[PDB]
């Protein structure tokens, strides 16, 4: 169905050093495919996916020259940010970028993305029209004034509508066999002893992709909230995700309580309860 | 393929 390509760039200024740490991470369908790191022994673009090895050495040299240029762009910009907010070079400062395009079900451009952030806060962001800019602080308005005069938005629009879409089309055709995958969650309810005549029923959800999931606990067809103890979706390590939802219930009436799991790539939401061995 | 930024901040 829908697809997306992203480039998550990071620049952490190092006090006492000329160049900052530049990390550019490429994504296709919220999954890593290319990565660059300045801290590496030989700083150049490396594939993070097995299907990405298909690209010749001409492509890697072309992308490394892009990162080497970007490494200096972020270096000068970080110094310009110090002047705007009146900060010191003796401290560490972070500058992040999120650029790319997300394609629809018909393999056509739905929206173009270009977002910037300084110190983990939104700095400047290119609007949906890819012609105007959104500036948060008065410091970001200086950047907006500079980029509107030089016509930076026009150059970003050319890539976001053209090159960004053009390259994603050939990336999907080079590895469609492993990209389009929706792992269904494996759910089971576990029994845990608690204080007095109360027990904790933990509804687990393991082995699912993507991380977008919902766990529900209900009594007599009524969803339980503010009493149900849930945990944040965590990665397993092999490429799949984990999540659980627990609720303190009295022993004997535990069969009345039912767990429901909501996830994509599932024909209908999974309904289950505790099984006594 | 990644994109190169034009003018600095």
């Amino acid at each position, epitope marked *: 169905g829908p697809h997306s390509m992203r480039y998550f760039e990071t620049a952490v200024s190092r006090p*006492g*050093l*000329e160049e900052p740490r530049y990390i550019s991470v490429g994504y296709v369908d919220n999954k890593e495919f290319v990565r660059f790191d300045s801290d590496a022994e030989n700083p150049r673009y490396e594939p993070r996916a097995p299907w990405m090895e298909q690209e010749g050495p001409e492509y890697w040299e072309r992308e490394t020259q892009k990162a080497k*240029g970007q490494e*200096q*762009w972020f*270096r*000068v910009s970080l*110094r*310009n940010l*110090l*002047g*705007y907010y009146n900060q010191s*070079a003796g401290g560490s400062h972070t500058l992040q970028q999120m650029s790319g395009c997300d394609l629809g079900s018909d393999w056509r451009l739905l929206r173009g993305y270009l977002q910037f952030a300084y110190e983990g806060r939104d700095y400047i962001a290119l609007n949906e029209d890819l012609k105007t800019w959104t500036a948060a602080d008065m410091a970001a308005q*200086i950047t907006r*004034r*500079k980029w509107e*005069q*030089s016509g930076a938005a026009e150059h970003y629009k050319a890539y976001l509508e053209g090159e960004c879409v053009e390259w994603l089309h050939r990336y999907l055709k080079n590895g469609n066999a492993t990209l389009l995958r929706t792992d269904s969650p494996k759910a089971h309810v576990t029994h845990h002893p608690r204080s007095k005549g109360e027990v904790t029923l933990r509804c687990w959800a393991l082995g699912f992709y993507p991380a977008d999931i919902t766990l529900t606990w209900q009594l007599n067809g009524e969803e339980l909230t503010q009493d149900m103890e849930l945990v944040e979706t965590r990665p397993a390590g092999d490429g799949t995700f984990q999540k659980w939802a627990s609720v303190v219930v009295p022993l004997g009436k535990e069969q009345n309580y039912t767990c429901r799991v909501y996830h994509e790539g599932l024909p209908e939401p999974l309904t289950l309860r505790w099984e006594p061995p | 393929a990644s994109n*190169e*930024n*034009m*003018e*600095t901040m």
Partner: T-cell receptor
Amino acid sequence: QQQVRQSPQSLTVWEGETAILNCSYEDSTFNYFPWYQQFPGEGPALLISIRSVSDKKEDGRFTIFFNKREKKLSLHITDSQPGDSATYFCAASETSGSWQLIFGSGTTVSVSP
Amino acid sequence: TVKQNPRYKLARVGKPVNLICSQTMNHDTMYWYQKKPNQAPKLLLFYYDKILNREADTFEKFQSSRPNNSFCSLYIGSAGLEYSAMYLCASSRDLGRDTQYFGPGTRLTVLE
């Protein structure tokens, strides 16, 4: 202020005499201090430079004496020649913006033959 | 080796001004300065490879373009009496402490 001060504005020294060209700064972040020399109808060219770690650097007649504690430096032309009669600029650079050179007002030396 | 022609430029108020600078040394950085009599050369803007950086206190006044590594130009939209100064063009093989090779400069005077 947060700038590079150069003194004197103009200097007249006799042929053979030692000409002292002073330069002061306030920012401790500055570590590279190059000197540029420009002749009439010509742009400034690198003459002699010095780093924060060194207190003295000699290149023939031209010598830079640097004091990190007092935040002051001076250019000395021990054997002045009428061919040295040019404008001298004292630049300062920090690790943060190594590409940028913060130049002083300048010193117009005039070696009287 | 850095070339700057013409040595002197004459322009009217409001009219656009364009100053070209040649290097032919394959240098990555090309700087642009403003020199007023008895004043320090103020950094206006610089071009590293194809990346442009303009100073926050002068970006509204000056614009720059670099088609190839050898040629870098300084553009003035609307000329005015405040622009009457010398414009020095420098070039360096890096974006750091290495030597800045300056050109002969261009003296510009703009009158009514």
